[PDB]
Design a protein around this ligand. Structure first.
Ligand SMILES: [Mg+2]
Ligand SMILES: [Mg+2]
Lengths: 145, 145
């Protein structure tokens, strides 16, 4: 149930990373990859809804929950994601939201990787997050500190 | 050209790597990801043929070319890959052979990533290769030497 809250925050964090690193403007495609139990608790079971809305800068106290499923549907239907609420970018689930049930990130089971790409298909940045406890968030590299 | 020969060799190099690093015995699943130009000549257009048989240690100046398509088919049909021809392991295309047409590895367009995992879904090793020229091969980290 920190399969909803945590992933929403992770997305949110990734959005700020894009600003912090001045790669938001250059970003034309985004990819999300879920692992271990996050991946296992599948398509339609909260986490995708949570992540997409969060990538749109909805955030989990701020946001309205009745709106989350409709909004996911619009995103898939239109193939447009409103990154951080500022920019509409192409989105294709087959390609941009993966459930890797057979795979495990090494720190913990509830793992995620966020990736941004520019319009010439170059990777701009990659960031791994984990959600643990009630649904607090941590980066790969802060996990152990 | 270097859409068949090169990738076959790359799969070969990976097999040697597995042996060279003493991870062949721990390996219980394998994954291949194609990028740029390699991913773009799709399912059934050479490169999957070539890689699978190469992962079976068929090797390209020495394999029977009449045998490659039938064999790829059995691998898919049976869902078993006979790694380095020493060991049958579970294989699922949906999961283990990916054509990432919307992505580029950074050095060159003909990129490949080989991954091996143990039976606990732990990743044992990644290796990126590229095929260049006639179909000579190189690793990521040797590309610039
Ligand atoms: Mg659509
Ligand atoms: Mg089958």
């Amino acid at each position: 149930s920190s399969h909803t809250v945590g992933p929403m925050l992770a997305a949110n964090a990734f959005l700020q990373l894009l600003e912090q690193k001045n790669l938001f403007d250059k970003t034309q495609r985004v990819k999300v990859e879920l692992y271990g139990s996050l991946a296992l608790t599948g398509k339609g079971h909260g986490t995708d809804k949570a992540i997409l809305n969060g990538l749109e800068n909805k955030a989990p106290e701020t946001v309205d929950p009745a709106s989350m499923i409709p909004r996911m549907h619009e995103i898939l239907d239109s193939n447009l994601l409103n990154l951080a609420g500022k920019k509409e970018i192409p989105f294709h689930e087959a390609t941009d939201f993966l459930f890797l049930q057979k795979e495990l990130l090494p720190k913990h089971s509830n793992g995620m990787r966020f990736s941004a790409f520019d319009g010439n298909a170059n990777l701009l940045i990659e960031q791994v997050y984990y959600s643990i406890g009630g649904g607090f968030i941590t980066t790969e590299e802060d996990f152990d500190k």
